[PDB]
């Protein structure tokens, strides 16, 4: 798809683990790795996860990526209040004219 499928929103209480799914197709996630970004209100996106499972320096290990088939998932263990933000996934896509696809975003609320 021109745009990846994410749940619109998600929520959890502090200390809990939460997962956020990202569904694509053979030409993106089935073929290329997935990146995850975290965006807080009014600020530029920050890179969280790349090459499906990996974390840049500074990103805690309670953030983890995984995938199955044409779907990928971001897991956040030991949820903290400050983790409340909108999360976007992205992948390269070789259908039509090749392009990067972002998901529609998932707003995470910490109860």
């Amino acid at each position: 798809q021109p745009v990846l499928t994410q749940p619109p929103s998600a929520s959890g209480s502090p200390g809990q683990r939460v997962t956020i799914s990202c569904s694509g197709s053979s030409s993106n996630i089935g073929s290329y790795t997935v990146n995850w970004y975290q965006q807080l209100p009014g600020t530029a996106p920050k890179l969280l996860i790349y090459s499906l499972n990996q974390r840049p320096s500074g990103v805690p290990d309670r953030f983890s990526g995984s995938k199955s088939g044409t779907s990928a998932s971001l897991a956040i263990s030991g949820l903290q209040s400050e983790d409340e933000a909108v999360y976007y996934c992205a992948a390269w896509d070789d259908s039509l004219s090749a392009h990067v696809v972002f998901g529609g975003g998932t707003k995470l609320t910490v109860l």
Partner: peptide, 9 residues
């Protein structure tokens, strides 16, 4: 280190 990590884990 990013490409290293990306290719070889």
């Amino acid at each position: 280190g990013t490409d290293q990590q990306s290719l070889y884990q």
